[PDB]
């Protein structure tokens, strides 16, 4: 059916007037990448561009960027034709001119600096009316081709002349500003962004289509998470890209005025959104407008809450507006807000992971001239506790430090600042290090919800335990049909018991990483904090966070911490049950197995935990994590030493055979000792080398040589002389008798 | 609407209430419905604002005026009956309170069928399976589930089919069909279950789901059905029927299933308060939760109020002898008070399960509350065989299995330990099937053969090898000392205290 028309999609290449298509549809149209091809678009405009054949994009879909789609006056989902134009010409002088106020506050011969390198050896095909763009010097500016000596479209040549003159002319009212937030500006919430897309695509992109059917739309979205995680940014980008009218309802803006005035403002905003259907209503800081009903002290606040409820119900009965909200916690807002019909679906924006932090940093450094030493992978891996706007402030601090290092020290009395000095600014790694260390407050202190970077290779030994855990986790989620075929409900929990230091935490992290599932590790400090604070209800939202991050591995490190603080083996005269452990049991009983949220518990004292947690259906699998043997210790050493550069003279098998009954974390402490001795040796060698030659006044005397870049066997031998037996043999006997008593108990 | 009422000015809110009541009186017979009544009428000690109290009083006066001269029936909606002002529930104002409650599996099935009445859904929907799987979803939750399934179907069809061909018409939209995958995705990824409190429903566990304990089954059938199925016989004799029974014995013998099956046989709702709930009420120092627990049980008459792990509080507050304190507990005390305040005629039966009957307070064993101490013994050969037959009815098992032999190996094994035996063996079968599937997938991918498919199921059932491996893995159920303690407690049913 006319394999000429074709549908739109996003793009990867950053070059302008460039495309890519699937590999098979290159003979269907019978033209290759170099073939300059024209494409059609509404308002009767057609633009020529280079072509390419890629793979990712489907046969029915094209790839391009805003630079071209704007002049084409076309959006996504739309469809266009295509035709090869080998008749293109090596164009001669083709007049251009900057079309914007971007030129505001600029100097220097922009012509050369900005254009020549872009037009360098490009043969960038051009057609009159183009709005191509170029960026530099912490700025970005575009130019329109007003004239094509040959018309309508031609090729550029390095020989062609440029008599480029004139003054900045104005963007006709048909031009669309790119200031609107876009999905390219969202990072760290890719899953959340996809969820929002699938929620709001039908109500907004297809209003009449949804009006034809009689289904209930999602008209309430609760974006909850830490402040600064881009909730309003996500809402603005979604509304702008989908074309929905965005109204920024601010809680402080709402209830800043009089009570009657606040209600009138809310009603006017809702009426305007209804008039501009399809529209998106976003209410950031919804907890300010709508607190808990028992907590809202002022009658004015309750009246405002009720007015908002009535307005959103009126939207529900007769409107086409999707309401979005932002809050720190879902429970901080009124429970009546989350009532069905009002706020049906709550999206946990959450925190960005290492990949998410990398994406956010890349987004914020897109227009920032940054050096090659930035290694944003390393920054993101190091970055912890920073969410969204925290990384934005980090990038701003790095840029400001670079500017204060350059401007405040270079251009003082020479001559007034011009564009040349500002566009030459570069951001280095030292600026990012300083931003990380001295000038960044991490606003994140609660539980981390991310896919851990620890893999199976990061764990040594425990192959049988690895396989059993792989079964118990992957098989329910990777082969649900097999479990459904048999009459057995998959287990939703496992308990890890054994000597401390055997890697139960890494086991949970690796099983979460293998399934690409988020891991929420609640260590013993968190359990004891909830127990001592008499706040067992925190387990409720912990399990809610775990469920919202499905698939998730809900790890409870040091599950016996409360049982150990409330006495030792026999302890006080009380029993073994604990309030926080009890809340964990209640949540697990209330947790559906299908939710593919797995609970892993690590206990260094399995005998002191309450047997109620060992009842079938909660933690029926008691996986014993034994003290590593020779092969396991060798594998642990291999996994640990993969990071620290170690000399080949090291003998890991011999080191393991000396270490009788040593735990994995005790082997990492062995590296702590030996690797730290190597670091100290390097530092002392550096300082003595610095001090020795400073006495001799020699202009050229540099015997530069690295003392040692690796760790030799001497450091490991010193660690052996320092580090000693891992744990008492009595503890190992207790663990082995507990393993022997897996049954015939209670 | 409560928000609609108190959204306006205080005088304006009162005027709106008066106008609504006057219009309802004019349109008699009329129904006044006040959803979110707790918003209009909170607890009297809790309503901070004077405007809110004035609105509460205005509503009270308007409904009293309806009572004296009108023909209007007033209905109200609230999360909890106690969340509203107690003066609202005064006789003459709100005489009868209807507990809407939560839908059961059949109720969820009915709701799904209602919401799919106008929805073109495929034959693979198997809404029985969805409803049986659906837990924690109530009403509008299932409505949102159906909406999510429909929206996923639309986003799969419309967003991928009709892009540049031609404008949408009725033919493409009426051809839309909802599949099972959409319902699975709605269940898993895009549905928040708003239910976390106690479940009030008729359990699906029947007598056939329990193996053995025939004498216990008959005794429980008597103690429950006979007061409610033959009230005339009990009234003829001068004996008040018992309103409670205690189940004591080794854990894993199916006391929970006994309560569920006796609730199902009478078609009575079962509210199972497990040990976690009792310990939550004890640790939180909120013993008053037992009050509304018993209120929910009474409102669901006939009901079997099951208290699983009734010794959980007595076990957390020390072991056998424990601390220097006694055996009575605040939550157990509230349970005793509620049972003493519960009329037997209300046909609300209380069942208590204790794995440590010796640590519970004897005050709960006083006649009139839990006078019947039914011992749930460790299953013998016949009971174990029946338990295995009941459990294996769900998991497809090969006929080569020898349940009598398996029971005769399992000396002194509890029923839940036999279900753990299936956990082991049936899981080994599942793992064998999965590994066979993956190795079959991997083996032929090397050969570039256009047509080479030796399709055959590895094993659809569970063979005796899996059960033998489970026997090599699973071991003795419980210590013999515990069984001796249970048998001596049974021997000391009398001549104590
Ligand atoms: N995930 C993110 N990706 C990119 N930028 C972000 C992200 N989160 C926050 N920001 C940046 O933070 C700034 C303001 O954050 P904001 O969205 O107001 O925080 P909140 O979500 O609390 O409203 C924005 O200019 C935006 O660029
Ligand atoms: N088997 C193992 N293989 C590799 N690394 C390990 C192993 N066991 C422990 N480690 C590492 O050594 C350290 C000590 O382990 P630890 O966390 O105490 O174990 P656990 O969490 O079981 O108590 C940890 O930081 C962990 O990263
Ligand atoms: N006699 C029995 N017949 C059939 N199934 C049983 C029996 N006893 C227990 N089960 C099942 O095996 C599991 C273990 O029983 P459990 O619940 O521990 O018993 P109890 O509630 O008496 O402690 C339960 O999930 C139950 O469904």
Residue numbers in the entry:
A (entry chain B): 21 to 766
B (entry chain A): 270 to 766
Provide the authors' own sentences about this structure as they appear in the paper.
In eukaryotes p97, also known as valosin-containing protein (VCP), or Cdc48 in S. Cerevisiae, is one of the most conserved and abundant AAA (ATPases associated with a variety of cellular activities) family member. In fact, p97/Cdc48 acts as an unfoldase that couples the extraction of proteins from membranes and complexes to ATP hydrolysis. p97/Cdc48 is classified as type II AAA ATPase, as each protomer contains two consecutive ATPase modules and assembles to a homohexamer with a two stacked rings architecture. The NTDs are essential for the recruitment of most cofactors, as well as for substrate binding, whereas the ATPase domains regulate ATP binding and hydrolysis, controlling cofactors binding and substrate processing.
To this end p97 F539A and UN were mixed without the addition of exogenous nucleotides, and incubated for 5 or 30 min at 37°C. The samples were then subjected to size exclusion chromatography and the fractions corresponding to the highest molecular weight were used for single particle cryo-EM analysis. The shorter incubation yielded two populations of p97 F539A: a heterogeneous conformation within D1 ring, consisting of a single NTD in the “up” (ATP) state and second, a homogeneous conformation in which all the NTDs are in the “down” (ADP) state. Both 3D reconstructions were solved to high resolutions of 3.3 Å and 3.0 Å, respectively. (B) Coordinates model of non-complexed p97 F539A (state III) obtained upon dissociation from UN, shown from side, top and bottom views at 3.3 Å. (F) Nucleotide pockets of p97 F539A state III: densities that accommodate ADP are detected in all D1 and D2 “down” protomers nucleotide binding pockets, in contrast to the “up” protomer where density that may accommodate ATP molecule was observed. D2 ring of this protomer is occupied by ADP. State II: Upon incubation of p97 F539A with UN @37°C. State III: p97 F539A following UN release (D1:1-ATP, 5-ADP). Taken together we propose that initially, p97 F539A adopts a two NTDs in the ATP (“up”) state (in D1 ring) (state I), a conformation that is favorable for UN binding. The inability of this mutant to transition from state (I) to state (III) spontaneously might be attributed to the increased Gibbs free energy between the two states, in line with its low basal ATPase activity. We propose that UN binding reduces the energy barrier between the two states, enabling p97 F539A to progress through its catalytic cycle (state V).
